[PDB]
Amino acid sequence: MREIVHLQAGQCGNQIGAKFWEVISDEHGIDPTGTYHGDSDLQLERINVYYNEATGGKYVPRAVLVDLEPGTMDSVRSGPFGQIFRPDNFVFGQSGAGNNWAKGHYTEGAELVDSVLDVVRKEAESCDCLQGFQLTHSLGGGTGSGMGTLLISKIREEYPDRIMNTFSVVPSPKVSDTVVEPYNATLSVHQLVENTDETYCIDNEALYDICFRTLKLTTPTYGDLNHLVSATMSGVTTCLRFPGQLNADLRKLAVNMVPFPRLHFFMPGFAPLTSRGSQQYRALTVPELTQQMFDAKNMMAACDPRHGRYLTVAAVFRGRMSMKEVDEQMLNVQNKNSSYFVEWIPNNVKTAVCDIPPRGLKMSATFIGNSTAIQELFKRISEQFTAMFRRKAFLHWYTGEGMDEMEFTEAESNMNDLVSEYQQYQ
Amino acid sequence: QVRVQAEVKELQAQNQALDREIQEWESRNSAHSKNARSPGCVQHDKVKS
Amino acid sequence: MRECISVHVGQAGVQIGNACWELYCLEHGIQPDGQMPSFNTFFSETGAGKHVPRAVFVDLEPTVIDEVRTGTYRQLFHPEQLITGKEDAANNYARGHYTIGKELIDLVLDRIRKLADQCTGLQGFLIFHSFGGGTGSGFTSLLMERLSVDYGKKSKLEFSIYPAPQVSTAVVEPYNSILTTHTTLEHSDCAFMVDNEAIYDICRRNLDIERPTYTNLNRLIGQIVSSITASLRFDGALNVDLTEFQTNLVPYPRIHFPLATYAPVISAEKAYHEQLSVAEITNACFEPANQMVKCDPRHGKYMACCLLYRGDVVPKDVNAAIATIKTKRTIQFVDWCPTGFKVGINYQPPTVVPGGDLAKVQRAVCMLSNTTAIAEAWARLDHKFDLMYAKRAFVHWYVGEGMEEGEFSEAREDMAALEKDYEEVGM
Amino acid sequence: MRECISVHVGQAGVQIGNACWELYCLEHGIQPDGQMPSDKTIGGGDDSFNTFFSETGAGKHVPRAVFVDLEPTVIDEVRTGTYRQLFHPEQLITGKEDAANNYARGHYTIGKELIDLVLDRIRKLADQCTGLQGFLIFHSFGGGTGSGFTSLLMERLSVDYGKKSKLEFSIYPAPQVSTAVVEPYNSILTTHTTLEHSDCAFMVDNEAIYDICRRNLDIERPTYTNLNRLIGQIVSSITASLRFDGALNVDLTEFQTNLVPYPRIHFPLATYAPVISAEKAYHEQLSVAEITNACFEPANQMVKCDPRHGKYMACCLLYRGDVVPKDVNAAIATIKTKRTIQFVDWCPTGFKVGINYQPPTVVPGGDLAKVQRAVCMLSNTTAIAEAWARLDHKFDLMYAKRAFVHWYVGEGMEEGEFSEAREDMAALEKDYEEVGMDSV
Amino acid sequence: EQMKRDAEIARTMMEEHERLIKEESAAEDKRNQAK
Amino acid sequence: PKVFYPNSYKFSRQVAVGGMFQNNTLNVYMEKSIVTGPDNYITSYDRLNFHPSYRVCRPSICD
Ligand SMILES: Nc1nc2c(ncn2[C@@H]2O[C@H](COP(=O)(O)OP(=O)(O)OP(=O)(O)O)[C@@H](O)[C@H]2O)c(=O)[nH]1
Ligand SMILES: Nc1nc2c(ncn2[C@@H]2O[C@H](COP(=O)(O)OP(=O)(O)OP(=O)(O)O)[C@@H](O)[C@H]2O)c(=O)[nH]1
Ligand SMILES: Nc1nc2c(ncn2[C@@H]2O[C@H](COP(=O)(O)OP(=O)(O)O)[C@@H](O)[C@H]2O)c(=O)[nH]1
Ligand SMILES: [Mg+2]
Ligand SMILES: [Mg+2]
């Protein structure tokens, strides 16, 4: 019907990938063996969107785990929800790219591309009618950023009707690991401004700042942020899986959000995040829930909307919940503010609602934001590409495999096309 | 910050101008009805006719 | 033999049709799985003792049809009638018009053919839809155009949810609403409309109900449709055939968009204390609150007014209260309509749904107004479209899926002609 | 078909109608559920309830009254009391924010959000009338809603309706024992907006009913529930001639032309003569003559005002029970020819007598007894000009040092409105003195 | 019926939160063991 | 050491982690009504919004 074939890339993907199928499978009542032990018959009617049925009534996900050091596949297979995949799908190389885009794009990665498309094209032909794909990855390294730009532009080559959606961790400079994160990130958008056209923006700096104020956590391990990431990639395709009082699938959210075809970088955020000490005293109604979607600290991308102006807003709700409190509450926020929300878009809110909440909650929601303040995240990573590239600090690590000095400049103003296009609409 | 404070004071003055005009229009409409009814009554003139 | 064929298209269509067909099935003595432990206006009969509705359900997203196909009405319909696409229209007039609906328009028209050959005295179709979505604009436009050029001069009535001023869920809703109004301006006999924001206000105010869902609206729309079509099933003092609205309400062939309301919308805890006589309910129809479409009533003058009374009603009460309404000279009727009204009466009182909220009232009125007031809604629905189309927002998807840039413009002018036509027939 | 619209206002108006409407559900056979019981519902020969109660097609009776205040805690004891389902729930208007004992708060600030709303529920109740005999305002000269909003209703009812009767019942602030300090600012500022737009207004002190209870009813420490039974008996006796037929039937429209000699002297004071505790009713005969001689006493008034210092302009005696009218006319000749009871020398006729057949009833728990006949005197004596020489002095001391005026001028009122409504009672203190003078 | 369902759901969520509290006390005692 | 009153701080650290509550939100609040009913939504600046109760003689728009 409306299926999606999942794909991963790199270490930063598989930790979000293996946390994803710990969440989707627990929403469908599926054991790590794969056989169904649920409670409602409604949990299995649209299980064919992500999964596939083997013999014996066992279900296999439609996912391919891609990396370039075989220690990463041993990390995920040995995990709790990790033996579920068909073992003919862990496609990897052996000689690591090693935070080198030019390896993962030109020389090392392209040795493996003819293999990885076969497991892509066999799980997509098993489908009857495609809707799209998924890539979970980052934009800091070279094993997953540069293969990720390979693996999209050679998958638009084949299935360019069906709408593809990637989910990208964009690297902040305030909490950074490697030195050359400008050199991989500011040019990897050259094939993500064009080829996916559905891409989300998650910052590791803002993912910490959720975890100090709202959650108020002491020790945030990397297994709890991917909890927070995989519970909002799930929410944007719950209408596509579960029945809705007013629903909107994946393609419907594209045609109503993006005003012009190169502005598709989003601002996700989960609604009812609350701490374990202040959980009981907190009210759970709908005007309380819109108190928390439109914050500046419950936003997973490290850019502040009040330094910009909103283009459009979606908010996919969940639960058994009324419909005047959806609609009249979000007219209210649009009316009382009226300055961030633009003119010449006379309604700046889209909405939707399912019937089934996430497991263990009375009601939740998922906020999607499309803001014009995201151009300060592109400004603050290209200025750090002015500094290192004037005196040519690190270009020899990637140019032993062949890129002249202007292919970085060609994809500089191709990225700096995108800064000004938010400016002209503000 | 200082220019936004200037516009806040501007819109407060505009608000009090419209509030004064609401008061004057309410008094005018009530006094117009009061002076308009005073000869005769309503619909009993029709029944008597 | 006053048979009508009902097609529900759009999610608004099928979710209204759920409440409509539970209301019609409880109207007669039909138990809901089909059997029975006058009904030939909407139901065919098979000699095992089974009743089959004259209904075709269609959407291009399978889950909203499949919940009907699995739920408690699975044995009501011949299960080929629940038509279902593969890929959703994705809120896209071009996709539901030019690209996606070309796989399913043939199936729905052939099942319409088989039902109209099952029928024998055919009178009209009831097409249930909205002005919000791709399959609620484009597929309905193709359906109406093909049924007009195929069946002839038979009454294709359409029922429309209307886009409110400050209430919408989409962003691009002026675009597809002005497009479906342009291309369905010609081949629908009449188009009733309702406003969700006004039903929200009535649900807050008259019925004492806070936070209403969509079932609490679709029950009211079911009561409206049943009060329209009680005349064909049950006979009364002054019956009104369904063709009579075409020569009655609309004066010029672009003005076929009348409004409606239904006056004793009242909960049990207040209707236990209040009596509701005929003069009371027909005076109560004309409040600016108790209408069902948001237009300011007092800024417009009335053209015609078709009242439908249901239950115990004596005709002199009607004929006195009508002149009582007329003589006030603030309810401005146009100076080229001295007749004013058109009234019908049926004997069988309004019924009650299980799990319901409208109180059982002995008599009820549904009034069909034709006002001049809706020029403000057409002014604002042209204005929002004009605000977005100054700099080409959201257009490139629809132009990649099948219209050039000029067809939005010619629909803009072919809709603005209607707003000039109201000032023409107003002055 | 005759009718009254008993519109209340104020927190001392809802507590009066709680004890007023329980009397009218007992005069008729009406249950608190509203439906008539089984014995009277087959014949249906009685249509005496149409003055006050409506009648729906399913056989339920809903009264004609709207309850108004800005304090949401005395209406919310009606929506949970015994009379939960009698009143129509759209006739209990109730505001969130208070009035808080300021006239100017209850005329200009808060009351404008309810002046439109209550004038739509009034228009329902007065629309069923073939003929409206008159309204019945129950208010108080004490605080915000009962004194401020009442003046806002008077300037909007008469503009709406016009030459239609509107009787008024009102407490009057006591000489010595009152319960407020801003109170004389109100009672001078509510008479001035009632001198034009009220056809009649009765006068009652709660202090004089505190005196009759230690004296006649033989009750020590009376509560506020026992003040609204006495007032509730009078408003029965005024309106009983509409509902139950009599020998001398006297309507509401009869009074307002038959008590006022000059058109700003509409402040008559009233009394109820046979109030006897049920012990002493076993001891005392209660004839028709001796309960006429017991209205003109120096102790059975209801305003603290002894009319020995004034001349009686007129009386309007209304009788109820079993009376025969040879024996009424024997007693009125005694009171005219008695020397002390002063009559103004431009009224040689003097009186107005009314007769009705229904005896007064007994509410269960009421301290009053079942007495075979009862009267209700109505007079506007000259002596009431004494009582304004007490209240208008109490306005003058406070306004000399300008005490308490800063809440009023800040709550949407101009300072000049105390001056013009002070000079206005500098005429009415003289207007009684010109007509009490003997003829020249 | 709706009131009974809502009370039952509230009891289920409070039981789950007590389970979370016990799990975190166990983990802190494990850290104290690691000391 | 018979009695012991030590200054505990576990709740103070537990609440003061991450900085105090400062409100960072888009402006959301409803201007409420004055008449207390579930119906009868009257604000100062949006008066005349009530249920016009049923009238025998004339409709509401011609008072
Ligand atoms: N009365 C009623 N209206 C509804 C209901 N559900 C949605 N609507 C209205 O329908 C409008 C949107 O309908 P559409 O945009 O056509 O969505 P759709 O019917 O699914 O059409 P497609 O998305 O193309 O399949 C919204 O503005 C809602 O107000 C419902 O259950 N009852
Ligand atoms: N006779 C009588 N007097 C009462 C009764 N209840 C209160 N009072 C008196 O009436 C005054 C009460 O203040 P009111 O002005 O009536 O209260 P209000 O009308 O709601 O005005 P605000 O309290 O300011 O809102 C006081 O003087 C009380 O002595 C009653 O039941 N019977
Ligand atoms: N969500 C998540 N992000 C991680 C984790 N480990 C590293 N990262 C992010 O990954 C970025 C570095 O890119 P990298 O993971 O090396 O790309 P790779 O070459 O594909 O492994 C850093 O900025 C981290 O923020 C993890 O366990 N979970
Ligand atoms: Mg749809
Ligand atoms: Mg009070």
PDB file of C-alpha atoms in Angstrom, chain C residues 20-121:
ATOM      1  CA  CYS C  20     -26.345   9.455   8.115  1.00  0.00           C
ATOM      2  CA  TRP C  21     -26.763   5.732   7.504  1.00  0.00           C
ATOM      3  CA  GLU C  22     -26.999   4.833  11.176  1.00  0.00           C
ATOM      4  CA  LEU C  23     -29.778   7.440  11.320  1.00  0.00           C
ATOM      5  CA  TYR C  24     -31.560   6.052   8.254  1.00  0.00           C
ATOM      6  CA  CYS C  25     -31.216   2.476   9.490  1.00  0.00           C
ATOM      7  CA  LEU C  26     -32.759   3.365  12.840  1.00  0.00           C
ATOM      8  CA  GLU C  27     -35.403   5.435  11.025  1.00  0.00           C
ATOM      9  CA  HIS C  28     -37.120   2.300   9.808  1.00  0.00           C
ATOM     10  CA  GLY C  29     -37.164  -0.901  11.838  1.00  0.00           C
ATOM     11  CA  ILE C  30     -34.063  -2.308  10.164  1.00  0.00           C
ATOM     12  CA  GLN C  31     -31.631  -3.982  12.515  1.00  0.00           C
ATOM     13  CA  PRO C  32     -28.114  -2.832  11.560  1.00  0.00           C
ATOM     14  CA  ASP C  33     -26.720  -6.053  10.098  1.00  0.00           C
ATOM     15  CA  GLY C  34     -29.363  -5.803   7.383  1.00  0.00           C
ATOM     16  CA  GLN C  35     -32.493  -7.782   8.168  1.00  0.00           C
ATOM     17  CA  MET C  36     -35.868  -6.693   9.519  1.00  0.00           C
ATOM     18  CA  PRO C  37     -37.309  -8.495  12.574  1.00  0.00           C
ATOM     19  CA  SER C  38     -41.767   2.988   2.365  1.00  0.00           C
ATOM     20  CA  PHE C  39     -38.140   1.962   2.842  1.00  0.00           C
ATOM     21  CA  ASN C  40     -37.809   1.604  -0.946  1.00  0.00           C
ATOM     22  CA  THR C  41     -36.615   5.213  -1.201  1.00  0.00           C
ATOM     23  CA  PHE C  42     -33.070   4.223  -0.181  1.00  0.00           C
ATOM     24  CA  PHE C  43     -32.928   0.416   0.134  1.00  0.00           C
ATOM     25  CA  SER C  44     -33.166  -2.418  -2.348  1.00  0.00           C
ATOM     26  CA  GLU C  45     -34.584  -5.716  -1.124  1.00  0.00           C
ATOM     27  CA  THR C  46     -33.423  -9.301  -1.626  1.00  0.00           C
ATOM     28  CA  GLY C  47     -35.702 -12.278  -0.997  1.00  0.00           C
ATOM     29  CA  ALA C  48     -33.654 -13.805   1.778  1.00  0.00           C
ATOM     30  CA  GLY C  49     -34.957 -10.844   3.771  1.00  0.00           C
ATOM     31  CA  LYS C  50     -32.033  -8.473   3.297  1.00  0.00           C
ATOM     32  CA  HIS C  51     -31.857  -4.717   2.724  1.00  0.00           C
ATOM     33  CA  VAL C  52     -29.055  -3.051   0.750  1.00  0.00           C
ATOM     34  CA  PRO C  53     -28.457   0.723   0.807  1.00  0.00           C
ATOM     35  CA  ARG C  54     -28.146   2.776  -2.330  1.00  0.00           C
ATOM     36  CA  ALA C  55     -24.731   4.066  -1.311  1.00  0.00           C
ATOM     37  CA  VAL C  56     -21.229   4.219  -2.789  1.00  0.00           C
ATOM     38  CA  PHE C  57     -18.311   5.100  -0.494  1.00  0.00           C
ATOM     39  CA  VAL C  58     -15.013   6.333  -1.907  1.00  0.00           C
ATOM     40  CA  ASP C  59     -11.601   7.663  -0.743  1.00  0.00           C
ATOM     41  CA  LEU C  60      -8.047   7.214  -1.932  1.00  0.00           C
ATOM     42  CA  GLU C  61      -6.652   6.492   1.554  1.00  0.00           C
ATOM     43  CA  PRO C  62      -7.669   2.920   2.454  1.00  0.00           C
ATOM     44  CA  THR C  63      -7.866   3.190   6.247  1.00  0.00           C
ATOM     45  CA  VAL C  64     -10.983   5.380   6.493  1.00  0.00           C
ATOM     46  CA  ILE C  65     -12.945   3.025   4.244  1.00  0.00           C
ATOM     47  CA  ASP C  66     -11.456  -0.067   5.900  1.00  0.00           C
ATOM     48  CA  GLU C  67     -12.634   0.957   9.358  1.00  0.00           C
ATOM     49  CA  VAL C  68     -16.158   0.962   7.901  1.00  0.00           C
ATOM     50  CA  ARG C  69     -15.463  -2.367   6.175  1.00  0.00           C
ATOM     51  CA  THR C  70     -14.378  -3.917   9.492  1.00  0.00           C
ATOM     52  CA  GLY C  71     -16.764  -2.145  11.884  1.00  0.00           C
ATOM     53  CA  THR C  72     -20.350  -2.862  12.838  1.00  0.00           C
ATOM     54  CA  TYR C  73     -21.800  -2.067   9.378  1.00  0.00           C
ATOM     55  CA  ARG C  74     -19.808  -4.715   7.518  1.00  0.00           C
ATOM     56  CA  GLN C  75     -22.935  -6.659   6.564  1.00  0.00           C
ATOM     57  CA  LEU C  76     -25.041  -3.676   5.524  1.00  0.00           C
ATOM     58  CA  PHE C  77     -23.322  -3.069   2.184  1.00  0.00           C
ATOM     59  CA  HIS C  78     -22.495  -5.254  -0.746  1.00  0.00           C
ATOM     60  CA  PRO C  79     -18.751  -5.161   0.039  1.00  0.00           C
ATOM     61  CA  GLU C  80     -17.713  -4.196  -3.480  1.00  0.00           C
ATOM     62  CA  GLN C  81     -19.395  -0.825  -2.935  1.00  0.00           C
ATOM     63  CA  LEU C  82     -16.704   0.375  -0.515  1.00  0.00           C
ATOM     64  CA  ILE C  83     -14.365   1.697  -3.209  1.00  0.00           C
ATOM     65  CA  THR C  84     -10.737   2.246  -2.201  1.00  0.00           C
ATOM     66  CA  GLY C  85      -7.635   3.646  -3.907  1.00  0.00           C
ATOM     67  CA  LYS C  86      -3.959   2.935  -3.314  1.00  0.00           C
ATOM     68  CA  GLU C  87      -2.077   6.250  -3.033  1.00  0.00           C
ATOM     69  CA  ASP C  88      -3.568   9.200  -1.186  1.00  0.00           C
ATOM     70  CA  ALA C  89      -4.573  12.339  -3.054  1.00  0.00           C
ATOM     71  CA  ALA C  90      -2.240  14.276  -0.699  1.00  0.00           C
ATOM     72  CA  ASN C  91      -4.412  17.396  -0.391  1.00  0.00           C
ATOM     73  CA  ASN C  92      -3.780  18.053  -4.059  1.00  0.00           C
ATOM     74  CA  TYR C  93      -6.439  19.184  -6.537  1.00  0.00           C
ATOM     75  CA  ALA C  94      -4.161  18.233  -9.424  1.00  0.00           C
ATOM     76  CA  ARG C  95      -3.638  14.761  -8.034  1.00  0.00           C
ATOM     77  CA  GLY C  96      -7.303  14.082  -7.303  1.00  0.00           C
ATOM     78  CA  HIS C  97      -8.278  15.587 -10.665  1.00  0.00           C
ATOM     79  CA  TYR C  98      -5.665  14.782 -13.307  1.00  0.00           C
ATOM     80  CA  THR C  99      -3.365  12.069 -11.987  1.00  0.00           C
ATOM     81  CA  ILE C 100      -4.609   9.751  -9.231  1.00  0.00           C
ATOM     82  CA  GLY C 101      -8.387   9.626  -9.777  1.00  0.00           C
ATOM     83  CA  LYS C 102      -8.045   8.273 -13.329  1.00  0.00           C
ATOM     84  CA  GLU C 103      -7.779   4.779 -11.833  1.00  0.00           C
ATOM     85  CA  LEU C 104     -11.000   4.871  -9.775  1.00  0.00           C
ATOM     86  CA  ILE C 105     -13.469   7.220 -11.521  1.00  0.00           C
ATOM     87  CA  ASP C 106     -14.378   4.393 -13.931  1.00  0.00           C
ATOM     88  CA  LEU C 107     -15.140   1.982 -11.077  1.00  0.00           C
ATOM     89  CA  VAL C 108     -17.300   4.421  -9.139  1.00  0.00           C
ATOM     90  CA  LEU C 109     -19.239   5.420 -12.247  1.00  0.00           C
ATOM     91  CA  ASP C 110     -19.886   1.797 -13.206  1.00  0.00           C
ATOM     92  CA  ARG C 111     -21.224   1.017  -9.731  1.00  0.00           C
ATOM     93  CA  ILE C 112     -23.358   4.158 -10.021  1.00  0.00           C
ATOM     94  CA  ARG C 113     -24.631   2.654 -13.293  1.00  0.00           C
ATOM     95  CA  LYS C 114     -25.504  -0.677 -11.662  1.00  0.00           C
ATOM     96  CA  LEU C 115     -27.364   1.026  -8.819  1.00  0.00           C
ATOM     97  CA  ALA C 116     -29.274   3.265 -11.246  1.00  0.00           C
ATOM     98  CA  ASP C 117     -30.293   0.170 -13.208  1.00  0.00           C
ATOM     99  CA  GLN C 118     -31.410  -1.415  -9.939  1.00  0.00           C
ATOM    100  CA  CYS C 119     -33.601   1.663  -9.397  1.00  0.00           C
ATOM    101  CA  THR C 120     -36.794   2.368 -11.351  1.00  0.00           C
ATOM    102  CA  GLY C 121     -38.126   5.893 -10.651  1.00  0.00           C
TER     103      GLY C 121
END
